[PDB]
Design a protein around this ligand. Structure first.
Ligand SMILES: [Br-]
Ligand SMILES: [Br-]
Ligand SMILES: [Br-]
Length: 172
């Protein structure tokens, strides 16, 4: 219950408006359409009515210290909330930048390119190396297995995509 699997390395961050897409991701795990585990902090968001903001902030920092990599669900709500300096997602994004974690942006409209209008401004301003992929299980896992593993050794900076051959070879 409080013990965490070593294989559960991936934190998923999203704007509260986009919870439907996260639930879809949770369906994929329960129905084994995905081949990776992940965790999140939506429980802390839910408990905001019974918790003071300073308590939520400390609990969130604590939660994110266990992440090795991030899947960021990308939409216009991601950019707005993630750039506004006050929202729950804005605090997540600040920690994600501070902890220098790799980020896979999964574009919720299926865009297989970089859409900077889905990426929060602090993450763009950090110039950290990121990759943007469609919101599809197999490309997300490919990014976790490749980009995220290579993040620290790479000399690249800023926003990348995966070329069409990667999607083709995955049967997408
Ligand atoms: Br776990
Ligand atoms: Br939010
Ligand atoms: Br496309």
């Amino acid at each position: 219950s409080n013990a965490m699997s070593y294989r559960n390395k991936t934190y998923v961050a999203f704007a509260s408006e986009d919870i439907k897409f996260y639930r879809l991701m949770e369906a994929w795990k329960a129905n084994e359409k995905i081949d990776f585990n992940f965790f999140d902090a939506h429980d802390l968001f839910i408990s905001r009515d019974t918790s003071k903001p300073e308590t939520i902030k400390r609990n969130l920092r604590e939660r994110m210290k266990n992440a090795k990599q991030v899947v960021l669900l990308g939409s216009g709500n991601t950019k707005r909330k993630g750039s506004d300096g006050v929202s729950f997602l804005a605090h997540e994004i600040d920690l994600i930048v501070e902890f220098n974690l790799p980020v896979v942006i999964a574009n919720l409209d299926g865009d297989r390119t970089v859409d900077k209008n889905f990426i929060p401004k602090p993450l763009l301003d950090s110039e950290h190396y990121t990759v943007s992929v469609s919101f599809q299980p197999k490309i997300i896992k490919y990014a976790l297995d490749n980009y995220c593993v290579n993040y620290y050794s790479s000399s690249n900076s800023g926003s990348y995509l995966y070329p069409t051959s990667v999607y083709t070879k995955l049967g997408l």
